[PDB]
Structure formats: structure tokens, C-alpha cells
């Protein structure tokens, strides 16, 4: 009983300090910048070959090779320049929700509803792609696999927890807990020592991979958070929920900086990504199109459109040369 | 394509495309169905020709040169709003209700009015006729349905339960196909085949523009 009141006064103190630190909004301080105008992107490539809905996609570190999983049980690796299928990996379970591409390009992990994170080896001496490891230990559907290195991978599940694995041993090295709902998405910081996870309790909290501690937590969303992406310099992140709003939280200030809501937007955000500079906040909605938000004034600086069904995944290359979108109509489109 | 290695890469890509097309052609013969219902309702014991293969459970029995894949979503124990859209393309929903045991009506209401399955027809199975008929004599159908007024006979009670299960439809472009099953029944495959072919006929009718 006393612990409940202690928690209540702790939350009150945290909120009071958080409000005390706030002096001016981002939209007020940066009001003097020239608008970026209208950013028109044209479809340069259209990657076909998938025969079912696409849930995930990841870009190679070299910004030329892709990876995508769909309901057909196929894991296809594309050549984003000449539109060629380098590999075609058949999954054991057709229910897959999260691709991941290794930073070194050697491995590609691909897990989903079947509760395990299958890891595939691309550079084999036999010339084929083999499942190097199959990581088990989660009691719920998997989401947003991310590679730290060639032998370290972070996973998120519907078990209201995130886990850090060791591919060599295959055991759950560290487990992060504290969420009260299904954890839907995570993104790894460029410094590669912290990561943030967006759960179904309308809250995203920052984690530490080394200590396994919840350093920070962020609130403000009215519904389940569906995607998260870090700011390029590793000091902010943008979240997307079914509330049809995007928000920009800052790790140093511990508060949301601005909101990216438009009156004409009804459906929520499925995927969130930034640009290389950190000025365009691209977000995918359920109304079949993506809106490019100028991340400093919250004005729609163009619309991608072009897709027939819901956009399920976004991807911005490391050099920023392209933006690739995947949707449920089994078509990937590359924009520039 | 000018180089030799790029020509070989293009040939490899074309071979992969051909393999993908063949696999997709071979992946259209099957029929994807979804199993649902309360626990201990016989949702895993419909057809004796089971041939299965924590997570998702697949059953791939075949009939009349047609492959039926039953995805039993049981055991997930998570929020259905986040993965139920993975089954948007299922041909039908097989709902199993045990008459010998309100929760089932709640699931049925939730699954029938879901935004993903507004046009997906439902095949409703009422299991354990003998158990229900033996239990109704011992206890009248009034403890769970206090609004009942009709006769306590088996036929009228079963029809009343069927009526309350169909009353939650509340949607056009959807049909509920009903069937009464016992433990010692073998023709469930035939009933599923008729329901699936009827659903396919209706979908083709809608696509062709006839209605």
C-alpha cells in the first residue's frame, strides 16, 4: 500500500522535473529556418518477384544489397542497382515478420510468428545458404531482429521483453524486462551501446545492452507504438503509433520535442525512418502512401504514394542515396 | 549485362525467378483455413485424418484432390490485434463450439466483426451432440441463457443456440455454414469441402461482377 503512494510521488517528482526542464518548444526555437520546400521523389526501381504480403526489409551496409521476407516463405536478397535476385532462401515457417541484415553482409537473420530467430549464413564453402543457428527461448511472436555484430543479435518479442543473444553459444545472454505489453519494434543506436524499444503500452524506453538496465522511459503516445528509428547522431528517436501521430523524443531532455500529426491523417504509422542528415522523417501509413515530414517544422514536405496496399516497411540506405518501401501488394519500390 | 560475369548473374536471376514462379504455381492448389474456438471444444479433433506435419500448429489433410491447411492459432496467448492480420487471406474460419460446457459467444462476436474478416465466411461446428442431449435433461438450458422461453427439447435448444450464434453476424457479404457434429463422426472433411467450394463460388461470383 505504501509502495503505491511511493511510486505515485516518484512519478509526480519525475513529471515536475520534466516540466521544469522545458522552456520553449522545438517548433518555436527553430521557427527562423527556411522551409525545405517540396521534396518530389520518383520511383526509380520496382522490385518484383514476391507472391505475398511483405512485412519487413533491411538494407545492406554497402547500400546496394537488400533483403525481404514475405508470407510465401521466401527470403529474397536483391541487387538494388540492376534489380537481380542474388539469393532465394526458403523459410521453414511461412509466418515471418522481421528481416535483419548483418552489418558485415555475412549473415541474415529472419524470424517471426514461429517463435525462433533463424539465422542464415550467406558465405558458405558449399555454395548454398544454410541455417547456422536457430535461437529459441521466447514465448511470443518475434519482431525487429537487429545485428550488433556477426555473433551478437538483439531481438524483441510479444513476451513483453527484449533479449540479447550470442549466436556462437546460442543462449540468451541478457534479458531486458520492464514493459507491460507486446514489444513491437526496436532500433540500435549508431554508437551501438544503447537501444530503444517500442511496446504496446504506449511507451518506449531506452535500454543498455551492456548492463541490461532501463535507463529511461518515454510516454505521450495514445496507442501502441508500431515502429522506432534513431536520429543519425544518436541523441533522439522518432516513434510511430496507431494514433496516427509521430513524435520526436530526445534522450538528453527526456521529453518529446514535437509532434507530426496532420488533421487529414486517420490511420496509424507502420514504419518510421530518418534521412542521413536527419531532416526528413519518412513514415509509412495504412492509407497506402508515405508522407515525408520535415523533422524540424512538422510540415509535410511531399508524399511518396505509388503503392496499392498498406506500407509495411521503410528503408533508407546508409549513404542516403535511396528510400525503399515495401507493402502488402508484394512490390518493393525504390525512391530517390 | 555487357560483361560476362554480369551475364551469368542475369542468368542466375532468371533461374531464381523461374523457381519462384513454379513454387508459386504449386502453392495455389492448397486451401488455407483458420481454426478458432474455446479450449476443450474439440478444435484439434475435427477430422480423424489429422497428419499434422508452442507457436502455430498446422494441419494439412487433403480431400478430393484439394489440400486443406488448418492453422490452429491456439497457444499464442498474446494480443490478437497484432498478428491476426497474418491470416487475412484464409478461405474461411472454422469455429468449433462445445455445447456441453458465453466465452465462445464472446470470441465469436470479436472474430466476426473484426475489420480484417468482414468478407471471410465462417464455418461453424457444434460439437458433442450426445453430451449436450444428455446434459440438458439433467440441467435445463436456463443457467447460462436465462432469456430462454421455448421448450426444453434437444432440437429447439440447439436451434436457439444456433440462432444466438448467427445473430452476431450483423454484416453483409458473409455467410455462416452450420453443422452438428459428434465424436464418432467421419464426414467432417466432406462438410468442410462443401463449405469451402461454396465460399469459392461466391467469391468468384463477386469477382466476375454477376452480383
Amino acid at each position, epitope marked *: 500500500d505504501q509502495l503505491r503512494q511511493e511510486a505515485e510521488q516518484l512519478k509526480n517528482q519525475i513529471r515536475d522535473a520534466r516540466k521544469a526542464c522545458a522552456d520553449a518548444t522545438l517548433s518555436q526555437i527553430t521557427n527562423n529556418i527556411d522551409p525545405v520546400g517540396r521534396i518530389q521523389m520518383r520511383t526509380r526501381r520496382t522490385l518484383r518477384g514476391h507472391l505475398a504480403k511483405i512485412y519487413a526489409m533491411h538494407w545492406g551496409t554497402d547500400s*546496394r*544489397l537488400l533483403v525481404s521476407a514475405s508470407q510465401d516463405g521466401k527470403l529474397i536478397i536483391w*541487387d538494388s542497382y540492376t534489380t*537481380n535476385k*542474388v*539469393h532465394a532462401i526458403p523459410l521453414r515457417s511461412s509466418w515471418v515478420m522481421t528481416c535483419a541484415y548483418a552489418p558485415s*553482409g555475412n549473415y541474415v537473420a529472419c524470424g517471426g510468428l514461429d517463435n525462433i530467430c533463424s539465422i542464415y549464413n550467406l*558465405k558458405t*564453402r*558449399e*555454395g*548454398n545458404v544454410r541455417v547456422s543457428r536457430e535461437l529459441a527461448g521466447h514465448t511470443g511472436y518475434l519482431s525487429c531482429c537487429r545485428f550488433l555484430d556477426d555473433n551478437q543479435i538483439v531481438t524483441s518479442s510479444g513476451d513483453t521483453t527484449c533479449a540479447l543473444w550470442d549466436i556462437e553459444t546460442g543462449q540468451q545472454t541478457t534479458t531486458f524486462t520492464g514493459h507491460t505489453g507486446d514489444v513491437m519494434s526496436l532500433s540500435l543506436a549508431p554508437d551501438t551501446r544503447l537501444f530503444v524499444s517500442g511496446a504496446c503500452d504506449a511507451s518506449a524506453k531506452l535500454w543498455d545492452v551492456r548492463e541490461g538496465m532501463c535507463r529511461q522511459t518515454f510516454t505521450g503516445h495514445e496507442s501502441d507504438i508500431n515502429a522506432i528509428c534513431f536520429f543519425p547522431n544518436g541523441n533522439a528517436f522518432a516513434t510511430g503509433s496507431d494514433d496516427a501521430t509521430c513524435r520526436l523524443f530526445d534522450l538528453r531532455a527526456d521529453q518529446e520535442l514535437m509532434t507530426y500529426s496532420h488533421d487529414n491523417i486517420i490511420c496509424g504509422i507502420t514504419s518510421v525512418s530518418f534521412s542521413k542528415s536527419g531532416r526528413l522523417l519518412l513514415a509509412g501509413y495504412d492509407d497506402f502512401n508515405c508522407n515525408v515530414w520535415d523533422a524540424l517544422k512538422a510540415d509535410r514536405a511531399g508524399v511518396l504514394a505509388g503503392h496499392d496496399n498498406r506500407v509495411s516497411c521503410l528503408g533508407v540506405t546508409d549513404d542516403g542515396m535511396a528510400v525503399a518501401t515495401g507493402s502488402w501488394d508484394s512490390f518493393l519500390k525504390i525512391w530517390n | 549485362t*555487357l*560483361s*560476362a*560475369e*554480369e*551475364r*551469368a*548473374a542475369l*542468368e*542466375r536471376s532468371k*533461374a531464381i525467378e523461374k523457381n519462384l514462379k513454379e513454387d508459386g504455381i504449386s502453392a495455389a492448389k492448397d486451401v488455407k483455413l483458420l481454426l478458432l474456438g474455446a479450449d476443450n471444444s474439440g478444435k484439434s479433433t475435427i477430422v480423424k485424418q489429422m497428419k499434422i506435419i508452442t507457436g502455430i500448429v498446422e494441419t494439412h489433410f487433403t480431400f478430393k484432390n484439394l489440400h486443406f491447411r488448418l492453422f490452429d492459432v491456439g497457444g499464442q496467448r498474446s494480443e490478437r490485434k497484432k498478428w491476426i492480420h497474418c491470416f487475412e487471406d484464409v478461405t474461411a474460419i472454422i469455429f468449433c463450439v462445445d455445447l456441453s460446457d458465453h466465452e465462445s459467444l464472446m470470441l465469436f462476436d470479436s472474430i466476426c466483426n473484426n475489420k480484417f474478416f468482414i468478407d471471410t465466411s465462417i464455418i461453424l461446428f457444434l460439437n458433442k451432440k450426445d453430451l449436450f442431449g444428455e446434459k440438458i435433461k439433467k440441467s435445463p438450458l436456463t443457467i447460462c441463457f436465462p432469456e430462454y422461453t421455448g421448450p426444453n427439447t434437444y432440437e429447439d435448444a440447439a436451434a436457439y443456440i444456433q440462432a444466438q450464434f448467427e445473430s452476431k453476424n450483423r454484416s453483409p457479404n458473409k455467410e455462416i455454414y452450420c453443422h452438428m457434429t459428434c465424436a464418432t463422426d467421419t464426414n467432417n472433411a466432406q462438410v468442410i469441402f462443401d463449405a469451402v467450394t461454396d465460399i469459392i463460388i461466391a467469391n468468384n461470383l463477386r469477382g466476375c461482377g454477376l452480383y
Partner: single-chain antibody
Amino acid sequence: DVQLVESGGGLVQPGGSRKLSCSASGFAFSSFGMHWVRQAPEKGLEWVAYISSGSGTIYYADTVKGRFTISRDDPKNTLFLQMTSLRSEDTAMYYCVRSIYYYGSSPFDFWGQGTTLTVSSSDIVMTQATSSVPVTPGESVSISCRSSKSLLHSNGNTYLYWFLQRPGQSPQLLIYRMSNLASGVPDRFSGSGSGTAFTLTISRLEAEDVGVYYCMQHLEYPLTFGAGTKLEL
């Protein structure tokens, strides 16, 4: 273990027909384009034939065009080579080489053990400046070979391959485009080049590194090898 072993060699009379079988075991045979490379006695390597994956595209050398026949048996994991008429110039040690082509692959990594065949009695020209170089261990060595055309394609990839043949063994790939190190070779190797002049350097040479170094172009068929530079100790 990847292993290519071939049989069918021996002494044959001129005008006869002989078939060589290259049996593969240890990799996905159906996904690898396979070549045939012959090495005349103390003369050097020379390309012969190539069959793509699935027997789609097949090429032949101008010397034996219309005279040899190459066939692929994917279920049996066997590669054949049928020759109709044999002259006295066909006597050589025939090698079987696998080649997989995609973005970032190593298309000459593994070579067969070699089979010896004896017979009783426009193109891109690659030239190697020196035929024999004596050197002591621990001293860097520079090997260079030129090409007639500029192998630097429009896509930025230069198709130059450097092979190493230890005495009594089969050639092994070291660098496949300009500096892309092969799988398992020591990191002391390094390669460079610009358009038509290319150089291979070996820092801290070891005693196991002596042999004959071949540079081959893959820009356009028929593939042509260099004269061959031999390291002496």
C-alpha cells in the same frame, strides 16, 4: 569437404575419342558454372570450355571450337567432356574448376586435382614481363602483367584474376578483381592496377609461397592466361 576429382586420362592415338568425367562431392553442383582448363607440359594454363548453371550457356575456345563437347549431369553430380578428334597438341593436364557468379562471388576458387592426357606422335593478350625471379625469404616481390584492352569495365569492376600454382599441385585463386582477397589465403598478399597495367605484391614472403603466378582476364570470352612468372629460391 569440397573435392573435385576427375578421371579418364591416359595414352591415346591420334584421331581417337576420349571422355573425361569430373565428379564433384561437397557442394551444390547444380548452382556452379563449371570450366575446363588444360595446362600443356611446362608451357602454361589455357582455357578450354565452360558450361553455365543448368547447361544454359556454353562456350568453347577458338582452338577446339566444334571439336569438343561438354555435358552436365546435375542429378549424378558429374561433369563430362567429349572430344572427337585429338591431335598432338591436345596432350596436357586437364583441370576442373568451379565458378559461381553473382554480386560479390569468387568465380575461380576451387580447382581439380588434374588429369594427365597424352597423345602419341581479336582476343585479349596478357603478357608477363619476367619468366623467373629469384628471391630470399622476407623480401617483398613485385609481379606485374599487362593487358591489350582496358579491363576496367563501365561498372567500375576490373576483371583480373591472380592464380598461384605450387610445384606438383593445382592452381589456387588469390585475388579475383583487383585486391579482393580470396578465402583462406594469407593477408600478406595485395593487388593493384589501373586500366591495363597491374601489379601483385607479397610482403614478408614465406618458403611455401614459391611457384608460378598466372594472371587471367575474365572481361570477355575466350579467357586468356598470362605467360607465367616463376619464383625461385
